Design a protein around this ligand. Sequence first.
Ligand code: GYV
Ligand code: GYV
Lengths: 171, 166
Amino acid sequence: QRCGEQGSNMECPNNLCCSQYGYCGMGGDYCGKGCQNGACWTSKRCGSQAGGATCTNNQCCSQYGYCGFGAEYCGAGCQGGPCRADIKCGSQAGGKLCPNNLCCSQWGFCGLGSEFCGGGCQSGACSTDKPCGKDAGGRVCTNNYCCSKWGSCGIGPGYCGAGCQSGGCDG
Amino acid sequence: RCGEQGSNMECPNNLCCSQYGYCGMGGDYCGKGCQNGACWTSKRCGSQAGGATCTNNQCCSQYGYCGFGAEYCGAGCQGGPCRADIKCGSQAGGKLCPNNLCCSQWGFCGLGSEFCGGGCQSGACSTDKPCGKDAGGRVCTNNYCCSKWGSCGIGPGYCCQSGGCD
Ligand SMILES: *NC(=O)O[C@H]1O[C@H](CO)[C@@H](O)[C@H](O)[C@H]1NC(C)=O
Ligand SMILES: *NC(=O)O[C@H]1O[C@H](CO)[C@@H](O)[C@H](O)[C@H]1NC(C)=O
């Protein structure tokens, strides 16, 4: 019902600003001082300039560790985000995982869509619901996903709670 | 809550929002009934779908599908963080940036001091120009509400001289 800290780090639709009180809106009382995420007037930090932090709302982290959109952000020197340059991952990039749970295709590139998540998907939010756990021969999940008691990879109470076999299981 | 159950909000890091309005990964969240996020069955968009836009700041491909990667943000990219500069504003027939993106004083869509500062035309400009009676009866862009104190925005304190009022 709320957003941000007050709501499990939820993000407002269409880049609306989540203010300090965990509500979605637009304007100084939402994008001014104390703005959490969304189109905050004060660009949040990220990348190397911010201990490896990433950009919320799927924004682009410029080479100067600033979040946003446009050539100045997703262009040359884009360190994380929907950068304009192809982003290699997995086998062809030293195990490297895709940002924000993007599927790493068989050809070794991050993204979302059947091409990236369908047959051959190596990691991320793969559409290929590859089994895990005991009945899968002890197979574990990528991205440190929790392996439900039923033997399916994912995230959530039914995955990380009771019966959880591997991955970042509920402590 | 998220999706229909949470004022159409989205989960961070492209986490799918299930039909029951909860965020997560796996078949329970991305499979049958997915509302947004990295849904296994990608959402339709663009000219192929009544010019509807993509959630999670996903790019709409030349085939009307939401997602990321070259196939989506490359050539034919209809919406989202397309790789090809997106023209807008006075330099593009008064066109609006999708998803409240800032249209710079050069008529390109983006987010940052360059795109939302200075002569920002539309989108979520960080300039906040006054509106209404005390601003020559000025009107907010994007149908933004003009507060009873001359400030453009959305919400209760903004929705009210002009705009998407209540
Ligand atoms: N068709 C195809 O395989 O494209 C692949 O190769 C280029 C690299 O030159 C990438 O830009 C494409 O995005 C990549 N496609 C996928 C799905 O990874
Ligand atoms: N090859 C191809 O046409 O891919 C496209 O069509 C399928 C539907 O058959 C969709 O799954 C893909 O998302 C779509 N690819 C793109 C980039 O839209």
